[PDB]
Design an enzyme around this catalytic site. Structure first.
Site, PDB file in Angstrom:
ATOM      1  N   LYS A 282       0.860  -1.178   0.000  1.00 39.42           N
ATOM      2  CA  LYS A 282       0.000   0.000   0.000  1.00 39.42           C
ATOM      3  C   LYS A 282       0.899   1.233   0.000  1.00 39.42           C
ATOM      4  CE  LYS A 282      -3.223   2.591   2.995  1.00 39.42           C
ATOM      5  NZ  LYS A 282      -4.145   2.524   4.182  1.00 39.42           N
ATOM      6  N   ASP A 287      -2.292  10.200   4.044  1.00 39.82           N
ATOM      7  CA  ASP A 287      -3.690   9.867   4.099  1.00 39.82           C
ATOM      8  C   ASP A 287      -4.408  10.865   5.009  1.00 39.82           C
ATOM      9  OD1 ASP A 287      -6.109   8.591   3.941  1.00 39.82           O
ATOM     10  OD2 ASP A 287      -5.509   6.974   5.291  1.00 39.82           O
ATOM     11  N   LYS A 294      -9.642  12.880   8.708  1.00 37.98           N
ATOM     12  CA  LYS A 294      -9.209  12.356   9.999  1.00 37.98           C
ATOM     13  C   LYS A 294      -9.249  13.486  11.033  1.00 37.98           C
ATOM     14  CE  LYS A 294      -6.163   8.686   8.082  1.00 37.98           C
ATOM     15  NZ  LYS A 294      -7.087   7.614   8.561  1.00 37.98           N
ATOM     16  N   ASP A 302      -1.387  13.269  12.151  1.00 42.38           N
ATOM     17  CA  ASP A 302       0.020  13.660  12.061  1.00 42.38           C
ATOM     18  C   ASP A 302       0.953  12.464  11.793  1.00 42.38           C
ATOM     19  OD1 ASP A 302      -0.746  13.069  14.849  1.00 42.38           O
ATOM     20  OD2 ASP A 302       1.356  13.504  15.302  1.00 42.38           O
ATOM     21  N   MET A 304       0.193  10.177   9.430  1.00 39.61           N
ATOM     22  CA  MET A 304      -0.264   9.556   8.191  1.00 39.61           C
ATOM     23  C   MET A 304       0.697   9.574   6.996  1.00 39.61           C
ATOM     24  SD  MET A 304      -2.777   7.697   8.833  1.00 39.61           S
ATOM     25  CE  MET A 304      -3.117   7.359  10.561  1.00 39.61           C
ATOM     26  N   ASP A 307       1.581   5.978   5.807  1.00 42.02           N
ATOM     27  CA  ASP A 307       0.612   5.142   5.097  1.00 42.02           C
ATOM     28  C   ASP A 307       1.162   4.560   3.788  1.00 42.02           C
ATOM     29  OD1 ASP A 307      -1.882   3.991   5.623  1.00 42.02           O
ATOM     30  OD2 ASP A 307      -2.916   5.407   4.294  1.00 42.02           O
ATOM     31  N   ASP A 367     -11.933   7.599   3.604  1.00 44.38           N
ATOM     32  CA  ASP A 367     -10.795   7.228   4.448  1.00 44.38           C
ATOM     33  C   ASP A 367     -10.542   5.705   4.378  1.00 44.38           C
ATOM     34  OD1 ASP A 367      -8.668   7.954   6.034  1.00 44.38           O
ATOM     35  OD2 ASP A 367      -9.766   8.020   7.920  1.00 44.38           O
ATOM     36  N   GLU A 369      -9.396   4.311   1.713  1.00 47.19           N
ATOM     37  CA  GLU A 369      -8.816   4.466   0.378  1.00 47.19           C
ATOM     38  C   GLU A 369      -7.819   3.369   0.036  1.00 47.19           C
ATOM     39  OE1 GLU A 369      -7.586   5.903   2.986  1.00 47.19           O
ATOM     40  OE2 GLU A 369      -5.609   5.018   2.707  1.00 47.19           O
ATOM     41  N   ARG A 371      -7.776   0.098   0.457  1.00 50.92           N
ATOM     42  CA  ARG A 371      -8.323  -1.093  -0.209  1.00 50.92           C
ATOM     43  C   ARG A 371      -8.710  -0.821  -1.669  1.00 50.92           C
ATOM     44  NH1 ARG A 371     -12.981  -1.782   4.067  1.00 50.92           N
ATOM     45  NH2 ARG A 371     -11.315  -0.702   5.222  1.00 50.92           N
TER      46      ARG A 371
HETATM   47  N1  LIG Z   1      -4.178   4.399   7.010  1.00 51.96           N
HETATM   48  C1  LIG Z   1      -5.138   3.497   7.624  1.00 51.96           C
HETATM   49  C2  LIG Z   1      -4.915   3.641   9.077  1.00 51.96           C
HETATM   50  C3  LIG Z   1      -3.777   3.049   9.594  1.00 51.96           C
HETATM   51  C4  LIG Z   1      -3.497   3.160  10.937  1.00 51.96           C
HETATM   52  C5  LIG Z   1      -4.311   3.860  11.811  1.00 51.96           C
HETATM   53  N2  LIG Z   1      -3.977   3.925  13.094  1.00 51.96           N
HETATM   54  C6  LIG Z   1      -2.876   3.333  13.540  1.00 51.96           C
HETATM   55  C7  LIG Z   1      -2.888   3.634  14.883  1.00 51.96           C
HETATM   56  C8  LIG Z   1      -4.021   4.390  15.174  1.00 51.96           C
HETATM   57  N3  LIG Z   1      -4.734   4.599  14.045  1.00 51.96           N
HETATM   58  C9  LIG Z   1      -5.456   4.457  11.268  1.00 51.96           C
HETATM   59  C10 LIG Z   1      -5.762   4.358   9.913  1.00 51.96           C
HETATM   60  P1  LIG Z   1      -6.822   3.896   7.064  1.00 51.96           P
HETATM   61  O1  LIG Z   1      -7.309   5.327   7.626  1.00 51.96           O
HETATM   62  O2  LIG Z   1      -7.869   2.753   7.528  1.00 51.96           O
HETATM   63  O3  LIG Z   1      -6.797   3.924   5.583  1.00 51.96           O
HETATM   64 ZN   LIG Z   2      -7.656   6.197   5.181  1.00 49.60          ZN
HETATM   65 ZN   LIG Z   3      -4.783   4.617   4.697  1.00 50.69          ZN
END
Ligand SMILES: N[C@@H](c1ccc(-n2cccn2)cc1)P(=O)(O)O
Ligand SMILES: [Zn+2]
Ligand SMILES: [Zn+2]
Ligand SMILES: N[C@@H](c1ccc(-n2cccn2)cc1)P(=O)(O)O
Ligand SMILES: N[C@@H](c1ccc(-n2cccn2)cc1)P(=O)(O)O
Ligand SMILES: [Zn+2]
Ligand SMILES: [Zn+2]
Ligand SMILES: [Zn+2]
Ligand SMILES: [Zn+2]
Lengths: 510, 518, 519
Positions: A282, A287, A294, A302, A304, A307, A367, A369, A371
């Protein structure tokens, strides 16, 4: 290839350090039999006390220096204890009136150290290294470690010792190791050095912030890596991506100022190719969540920039594979790289988009995204006609509530492939746990209007639901999916782990 | 045993239905090779068409009636397909010139129905029972099911068919009439016959657990629940003991006692025992979390999504364990001694409640710093586990609605099992397969243990930093088992059927199969 | 009376009530404008408008029986001032007898028929002239058109807003607090308006009495102290009274009402007052008020942002309005009616003894109820109060309650909502809203939502799982407890408290009284 800027001060590449101080360290492994010489620098004994919890320190190795031997007498060392990670070190003169430092790191009470235990041992060793100006460290193993755990000790040691100073505006030159049956451990050294760099390189990409590390700069970095390792490479731009009808992946990138770039590196053994593998990471360079911003407490916007950890792991794997050159395999290193942003141009909640395999997808949450990008990457991967597809991704925050920050989750459609991942987790010492794809939940992705929903409305087991979604994009190939959302970032140490590089490399090699 | 009341209108017992309409069903199993008689009521064919996704309905079995056989001819059935869950009703006259109802339920194209799939078949079937006053159902199996799956079909039919009206008064459903007869036609009927009464036993154990769970907290409190357990033990001729506060104080169960401090109902520890007549080869303690209402205590369940109205279900583990005692006490397995334990109490807000920060002393002498009063389950279980290990058993298995995080790991279908012993874990997984109550092995990650370190007490109740609460709770529990094979089944996600708005009675069959296969 | 339980000796054991207010010492004299206005001591205020002319000039039309004052108030002198709604001015001059007099006006805008809201703005402006000025007399000259009800409404509102509640003041009483002793009113056709004066005084006190009970905090005003005050009121008015205690409530099997009060240190007390006319009874009415003396929410604690737990002493506003109505009815003594004044009084608290979310309880009519949220406690107490009411064998049941916060989202702070099962009765309520000038709006009981109250285990759910229209769902729940009597339900959750003024309105007293009287 040209990185767009908003202002002239915007960076146009990711800084990368290839030649690190770790690479200048000369490592020698000696057998404990014959005694340990203590001539210079720092010498640290790794010591446990089985049964006796917080028991006294006792050194069993013969030391060929009389002053240091006296220091290490039972009566002195018992003043200290073996509680996991506890250390002491003392400066003194040896037989030659040379300044030496001698101490220990406690390895607790259990005969066999887990990877987590070993990391704590190393962290205590590294604190000593960071606090002392030394030309040399010598480590004496009075604990039991198998070949993989020994290599893991070196990898972690190198990785934790190395300090990333790229965004800021004296290391040891020698490492000695005393261990019983030293000859069997010697080949692990240069493997460890290679694994260390793959992991450190992945860490460099991850730690690089999203202004520095964007879809254009990250694909440029992958090209440079491919050129150094002589891997074949191909970066797919928007026109090609449109021709390939990657509507899911492109939609995620619509709101970004950086054009989508799809990375495809290939390693190919010289001989006969007996196994073909696609590794898919990925690659979201930032993100924001998109219109589903978020903004909730705990959403950690902070963080992200991390990602693209899955992409980083895959590129780190390409370093190791391209360096170690396994026989009889063809490896494809893939990432659909883009940035998830808020803009007049962004995709919206509710949008219906079409993946490269013709499946229409109702977006329930911008959010989710990852997948969507993985969907098109998975279709691309299966068209390569491989034996195995493995993806690795920071996909679901739910992982924090299931396995936590230590073990990654593995999901898949093929039991044999999953067991290979689990075996690779064992030998890499990067912990992974098999989680089920529960078919009963599939019905919650039945969209009213599109072929399928991106997310569930009702089911909270989102790591499983995401796996169900991804599974819809692999039709007849063994596939496994590693969710590293919980394990990728080291929260305490405020840095990446580079998680997955060694896992994936062990998978390819063995 | 006397249930305290605030006003005279407060109930003083749980209503239990022991002889259910399901028990009045006369079940007959016939071999399919002799052909089916279609005489009266409703006759239902379970059909599939392997391969063809929604292939036509083809009635293979012999039907000892010319008129009906003509009706179910391929030509007439072609218009109907076998898509999972589909059903059709037919009406016709038999050779006797009597009117008969016939129909089918689609079982799909996959040749091996899953546990979740079979449930969908049964649900379709129950829909056909539900608004039709029938005296008899006949089911003809034109699909393949192993003995366990056949038993599962019957268990599930019985459970879903049964409606709980204990708390209805004004709102009848006056159109309710249960069939009095169930006929079954199946290949090699002789092997399946024994599964009938096993299924009926399993049904009731599960349904009994369901009744205790669904019973609200004013009906089902620690005194009434322990009273119900005594009455079950008497009906089953099990030895039984209920420990009261004075005894619990003597045993120094301070973790358990602290949780119940704010309740108007005194803590009651349930201990039933089943013992085989012969050589005892295995001794097992089954421990159920028994919180009759979980308000959260001073850490009140006030946050969005905390589901405080569901919290009468927090003695689901205790219900599972008592349901298992019904099955074991009825089936009477040999070579075994089973102890059925629950530290029962209620977690409430009061001048007398325990507080966040309190330091309390468990019966093994470990002091515990309470970080959150809403992590009360693991405290009661700590003292229950210590008690269990003192019995000197081979296995301790606990079952509990312990962590809401289970909804984020495995969700609503699969429970999680944690443990200190791989062999015991494998036995539970095997029991999951044969009971058809799905369980998934989750790890006790020792790296998180350091986060239970307390500055002042021996151990913290909860983790400062780790969000994987199902694992952290497991780590806490493990501290109260010193040297005995132990496993922990977290059923927080699976206990309540949110769609059907009722309990599942999850775990009764799982625990019974564990007991029996051992 | 019952003894109020105390935790400590400093806990109050009764609600302080002021019966003989300064408003009652005020002598009111009404004169016909055609006789001219005498302008002497105190403050003489003209109520002036200018129809169609927005912010138009002030013109005093009334004959003034004083040459100096008439000259002062002549058009040329008044044209510098305007009639903007709510504006006011003070004048000072010497009259024909060489005594200094204070004169002024309040502007009544440019629209001829003043709404109830407009009139309140006029009154508030007038009250601002009464405050911080030690006056012995106020004189008011009506140079605007008002019907009889609106004239009474003026007086009621004046009396209400002028009054200052100092029952809980100790070290901070207003040193300068001093009320007029005389109120003069000049108006055309004065003889037709005279009958409204004492009616207004009675309506003011009913409203102010209700206000006193509501403003009284939950330590002062608890179920025992509140029922005690109802007894005292009944004794003063010669109404019949019966206060049902727990043992009697148990015998009547009022499980829904009893369950709510389980967690309180104060025993439940059910208030039943009765007025009966001496004549032949033509109509029988039950008035039911929600009597929750404090609503913490119970285990469903009010902890969410905006839940305003600190306002929750006001959750007996419905009981207060019914009692205020009892005052008015017992004072004015209508003929040919029998009125029952009912309240199931209790306190919703958190305790080891409290009912729990999920509990299944049995109402007095035998219906079992699944409690989905302990903070929907009002409808549970009203359930048993409605069963009790219907057994009295009345023609109408009307309840009034601070039942649903959702009212603030539907009608807001000015209009109450009425729901019911009978159109005739609803229209009678709406008609009483018109004549009382306490605005109410008719809202629907939407039967489609009824299915969302189906319980899996009990006969009925207390709350909806899926429907957010809680004022409607609550009404659906209540309807299940009236079998064959015309019934209406008035939700005053939004209008009871005056957030701006930081005081209760005593809303509903005049509404309910007009309802009783008009019938
Ligand atoms: N990037 C993904 C993600 C990954 C980790 C966390 N996260 C990790 C620790 C706390 N939150 C949240 C979203 P997504 O927002 O599900 O796409
Ligand atoms: Zn996301
Ligand atoms: Zn993500
Ligand atoms: N009773 C436990 C529990 C179990 C389940 C849930 N829960 C299940 C679904 C949603 N929430 C919450 C708490 P506890 O509050 O962790 O003790
Ligand atoms: N007491 C009722 C109530 C009344 C008013 C308000 N409320 C009025 C204004 C803002 N919130 C909230 C609850 P309840 O909690 O719905 O029973
Ligand atoms: Zn809890
Ligand atoms: Zn609990
Ligand atoms: Zn409330
Ligand atoms: Zn209320």
């Amino acid at each position: 290839s040209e990185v767009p800027q908003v202002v002239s001060l915007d960076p146009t590449s990711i800084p990368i350090e290839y030649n690190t101080p770790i690479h200048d360290i000369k490592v020698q492994v000696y057998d404990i039999k014959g005694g340990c010489n203590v001539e210079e620098g720092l010498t640290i004994f790794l010591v446990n006390n089985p049964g006796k919890e917080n028991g006294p320190v006792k050194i069993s190795s013969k030391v060929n220096d009389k002053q240091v031997s006296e220091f290490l007498k039972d009566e002195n060392m018992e003043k200290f204890n073996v509680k996991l990670g506890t250390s002491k070190h003392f400066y003194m003169f040896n037989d030659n009136k040379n300044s030496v430092a001698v101490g220990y790191v406690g390895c607790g009470s259990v005969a066999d150290l887990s990877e987590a235990d070993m990391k704590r041992v190393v962290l205590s060793l590294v604190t000593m290294l960071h606090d002392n100006k030394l030309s040399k460290l010598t480590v004496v193993f009075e604990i039991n470690v198998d070949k993989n755990l020994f290599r893991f000790f070196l990898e972690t040691l190198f990785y934790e010792y190395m300090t990333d100073e790229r965004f800021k505006s004296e290391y040891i030159k020698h490492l000695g190791v005393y261990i019983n049956n030293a000859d069997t451990y010697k080949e692990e050294v240069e493997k460890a050095r290679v694994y260390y760099f793959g992991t450190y390189y992945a860490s460099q990409l991850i730690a690089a912030p999203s202004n520095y590390c964007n879809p254009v700069s990250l694909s440029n970095a992958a090209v440079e890596l491919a050129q150094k390792l002589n891997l074949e490479y191909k970066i797919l731009g928007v026109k090609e991506l449109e021709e390939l009808k990657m509507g899911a992946y492109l939609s995620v990138g619509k709101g970004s100022m950086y054009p989508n770039k799809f990375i495809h590196l290939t390693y190919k053994s010289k001989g006969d190719v007996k196994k073909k593998i696609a590794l898919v990471g990925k690659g979201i360079t930032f993100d924001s969540g998109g219109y589903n911003l978020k903004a909730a407490p705990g959403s950690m916007i902070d963080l992200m920039k991390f990602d693209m950890s899955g992409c980083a792991a895959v590129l780190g794997c390409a370093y190791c594979v391209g360096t170690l050159k396994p026989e009889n395999v063809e490896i494809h290193f893939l990432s659909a790289v883009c940035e998830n942003m808020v803009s007049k141009n962004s995709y919206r909640p509710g949008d219906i988009i079409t993946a490269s395999n013709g499946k229409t997808i109702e977006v329930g949450n911008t959010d989710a995204e990852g997948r969507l990008t993985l969907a098109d990457a998975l279709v691309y991967a299966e068209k390569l006609g491989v034996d195995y597809i493995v993806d690795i991704a920071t996909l679901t925050g739910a992982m924090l509530y299931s396995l936590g920050t230590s073990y990654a989750g593995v999901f898949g459609n093929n039991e044999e492939l999953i067991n290979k991942i689990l075996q690779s987790s064992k030998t890499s010492n990067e912990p992974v746990w098999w989680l089920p794809i529960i078919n009963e939940y599939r019905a919650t992705l039945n969209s009213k209007y599109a072929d399928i929903n991106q997310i569930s409305s009702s089911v909270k087991a989102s790591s499983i639901v995401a796996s169900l979604f991804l599974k819809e994009f692999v039709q007849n190939t063994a596939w496994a999916h590693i969710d590293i959302a919980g394990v990728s970032w080291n929260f305490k140490a405020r840095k990446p782990k580079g998680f997955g590089v060694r896992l994936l490399t062990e998978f390819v090699l063995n």
